[PDB]
Write an enzyme that holds these catalytic residues in place. Sequence first.
Site, PDB file in Angstrom:
ATOM      1  N   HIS A  24      15.190 -28.385 -10.450  1.00  0.00           N
ATOM      2  CA  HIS A  24      14.137 -27.869 -10.285  1.00  0.00           C
ATOM      3  C   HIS A  24      12.997 -28.257 -11.111  1.00  0.00           C
ATOM      4  CE1 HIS A  24      14.225 -24.316 -12.905  1.00  0.00           C
ATOM      5  NE2 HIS A  24      13.073 -24.529 -12.850  1.00  0.00           N
ATOM      6  N   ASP A  42      21.548 -26.234  -9.285  1.00  0.00           N
ATOM      7  CA  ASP A  42      20.139 -26.530 -10.052  1.00  0.00           C
ATOM      8  C   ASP A  42      20.569 -27.470 -11.146  1.00  0.00           C
ATOM      9  OD1 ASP A  42      17.672 -26.530 -10.558  1.00  0.00           O
ATOM     10  OD2 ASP A  42      17.249 -24.586 -11.278  1.00  0.00           O
ATOM     11  N   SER A  68      12.954 -23.127 -18.461  1.00  0.00           N
ATOM     12  CA  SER A  68      13.818 -23.676 -17.338  1.00  0.00           C
ATOM     13  C   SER A  68      14.308 -25.034 -17.892  1.00  0.00           C
ATOM     14  CB  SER A  68      12.833 -23.604 -16.072  1.00  0.00           C
ATOM     15  OG  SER A  68      12.216 -22.691 -15.667  1.00  0.00           O
TER      16      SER A  68
END
EC number: 3.4.21.5
Lengths: 32, 251
Positions: free
Chosen positions: B43, B99, B198
């Site tokens: 992502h 992910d 992230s």
Amino acid sequence: GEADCGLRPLFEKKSLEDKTERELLESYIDGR
Amino acid sequence: IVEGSDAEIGMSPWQVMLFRKSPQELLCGASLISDRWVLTAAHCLLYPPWDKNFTENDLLVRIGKHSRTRYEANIEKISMLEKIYIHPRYNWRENLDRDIALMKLKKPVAFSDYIHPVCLPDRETAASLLQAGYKGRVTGWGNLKETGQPSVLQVVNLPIVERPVCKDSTRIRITDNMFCAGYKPDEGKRGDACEGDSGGPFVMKSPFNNRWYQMGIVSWGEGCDRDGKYGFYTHVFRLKKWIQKVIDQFG
């Protein structure tokens, strides 16, 4: 299999622990 | 990183900063697993819902950093991306399942006291270390709270949470390709990963060989540091097969 991976030059390599390192170590006992 | 603390110089030599060329900006965290391979969250590179679809030349990778903004000349290394690899079954539509992404550097980086690769987990490591109650470590230059910027790399250790709890704590659907960590309401302790973090690594130190293994990648959450909430991470071992496949194929 793993060669050098995972061994920090400024720590493991110099037999030196970082400040919180053993918090993880002790969590394996799940307490104390 | 919320409720964390300044990292020590070189306590996370595999920490990578994913950078957008123009406009300049910190996009995500990432990790060095080889002199030519960087691991991160899918992502971070691809998320159509926001038109996210970065390519080789839209980014740069900064390795060996400590300061959030300071240019650490001849210490940090700025590398270019040769090719991006996103998991073929990465589910950005519903819950960011699988992910994970890999990026091959144009030129191999030289290791130093500040640049060194982390270990991927293997079956033994995964089976014995990925257990609820055990703590792992997350690091990054993400916000200090929900939408806030550290001047230096932050670090925080977080206990892994039993799957049931992870599920009954959100209405989003959890896969076996992900796990959650964070503190529960009662045990007066806080901390979580937050935007900017992230793509970063969730690592654990082996009590047997003393090496560090990236058990996970900061994947997603619902806010930052909020009771009854937990952070979710890509289950690296579960997807190691794909990892090995890409590395071996493009070598």
